[PDB]
């Protein structure tokens, strides 16, 4: 039903040898905003990747049944890792990423990404060649371009990994939260956001926790805050 | 004879001005719209895959 992924693996680890994703179970709600957040150092990015299918699964069980599901994930999940990747093409071509042009979708995403002054200040606007072997930009700008490209798509499922960590400022993080709320929520696109800042968890349809392994279910915040882990509530509310 | 057989110096030729600044991609070199009948009153299409009916000696006459 709501669960868009299903795993019960005993180990899904990189390379060969001792596991790093040992003994996990997970489920991602449909239309969710699962905020997989934990201590920095173990679990998150590797979990997202191994779910994408780019790790040496040692004890996993095959289960991928979305709404009407299935052959190898059967679909295209947008993505943006902790390091951005850009084509060496125009900003418009970069964002479009091989799709039908749509001034509505593109304009809404440009407004929701707050990159307009950067585009205006470039010598040719969205027609300017970007990326390596081109005009070089700052890390926050590149994060914005990557998340904008991952936004304007045709994929019900979505993924992210620390999209605000390299942002220009926490004010820009609030702006990106507002844009995600305005555009993502208008649709029914499964989003799984990840960020080391715990303040932004509005409408948390699920909360997966990681500390050398999964902690508990992706349940609501209300049941989470008093599920025999009060230190979690203290740490999250205090900061 | 054998101009540039030695082929080491490449992969780092920096982008031209028209490359990085994106002045070259302004092509504006669209082909003209295909007419159906020319201005000279001659129809100009291209029929293809027509089964050739050979020739006849009557054609020489
Ligand atoms: C001219 O060589 C010879 C002279 C004398 C003798 Cl006894 C043997 C040879 C010989 O075995 N030759 C190898 C065959 C050969 C010949 C000439 C040329 S070439 O036309 O001078 N150079 C080019 O074509 N380069 C183009 C452009 C970029 C890469 C693609 C090809 C290229 C290849
Ligand atoms: N692509 C990779 N190949 C091999 N090892 C990796 C790779 N990515 C991470 N690791 C290692 O595996 C361990 C688990 O990484 P994990 O994905 O949990 O990092 P993370 O929690 O996302 O950290 P951060 O969010 O700071 O990047 C880490 O110690 C890391 O050094």
Chain B interface, mutation test: which of A92, A125, A129, A137, most B Cβ atoms within 10 Å? A129
Q: Which of B14, B15, B22 sits opposite A124 (nearest CB)?
A: B22
Give the Cα-Cα-Cα angle A149, A140, A221 (nearest 5 degrees): 75
Per CB-CB distance under 8 Å, the chain B contacts of A135 are 20-21
Query: Are residues A24 and A213 in contact, defined by beta-carbon separation less than 8 angstroms?
Result: yes
Q: Chain A contacts of B22, Cβ < 8 Å?
A: 90, 124, 127-129
- Please identify, by atom number, the ligand 1 atom nearest to the C-alpha of residue B2: 21
CB A164 within 8 A of CB A103: no
Distances (CA, A) of A191 to A63, A158, A194, A201: 19, 5, 10, 13
Which residues, including other chains, have CB under 8 Å from residue A153's CB and lie 6 or more apart?
A: A76, A78, A97, A99
Q: Which chain B residues touch A90 with a CB distance below 8 Å?
A: 22, 25
Task: Answer yes or no: do A133 and B25 touch at CB < 8 A.
Answer: no
Interface residue of B11, B13, B20 to substitute, partner A, most A CBs within 10 Å: B20
Q: Which two tokens stand for residue A129?
A: 């060649």
Which residue, A181, A146, A150, is CA-closest to A165? A146
Way the structure was solved = cryo-EM
Q: Do B22 and A90 touch (CB under 8 A)?
A: yes
Residue A21: φ, ψ to 5°: -120, 25
């Amino acid at each position: 039903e709501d669960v868009a992924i299903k795993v019960t693996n005993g180990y899904f680890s990189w390379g060969s040898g001792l596991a790093t994703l040992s003994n996990i179970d997970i489920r991602i709600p449909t239309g969710q905003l699962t905020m997989i957040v934990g201590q920095v150092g173990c679990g998150k990015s590797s979990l997202l990747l191994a779910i994408l299918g780019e790790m040496q699964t040692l004890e996993g069980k095959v289960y991928w049944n979305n709404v009407n599901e299935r052959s190898r994930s059967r679909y295209s999940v947008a993505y943006a890792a902790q390091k951005p990747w850009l084509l060496n093409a125009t900003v418009e071509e970069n964002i479009t990423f091989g799709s039908s042009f749509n001034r509505q979708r593109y304009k809404a995403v440009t407004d929701a990404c707050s990159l307009q002054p950067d585009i205006d200040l470039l010598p040719f606007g969205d027609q300017t060649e970007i990326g390596e072997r081109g005009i070089n930009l700052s890390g926050g700008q590149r994060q914005r371009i990557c998340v904008a490209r991952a936004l304007y798509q045709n994929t019900n499922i979505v993924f992210l990994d620390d999209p605000f960590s390299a942002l220009d400022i926490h004010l820009s993080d609030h702006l990106m939260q507002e844009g995600i709320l305005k555009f993502l929520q208008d649709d029914k696109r499964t989003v799984v956001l990840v960020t080391h800042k715990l303040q932004y968890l509005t409408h948390a349809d699920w909360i997966i926790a990681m500390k050398d392994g999964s902690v508990l279910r992706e349940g609501t915040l209300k049941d989470i805050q008093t599920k025999d882990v009060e230190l979690y509530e203290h740490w999250k509310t205090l900061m | 004879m054998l101009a540039r057989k030695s082929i080491i110096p490449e992969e780092y030729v920096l982008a031209r001005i028209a490359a990085e600044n994106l002045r070259k991609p302004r092509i504006r070199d669209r082909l003209p719209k295909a007419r159906f009948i020319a201005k000279s009153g001659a129809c100009n299409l291209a029929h293809k895959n027509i089964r050739e009916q050979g020739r006849f000696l009557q054609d020489i006459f």
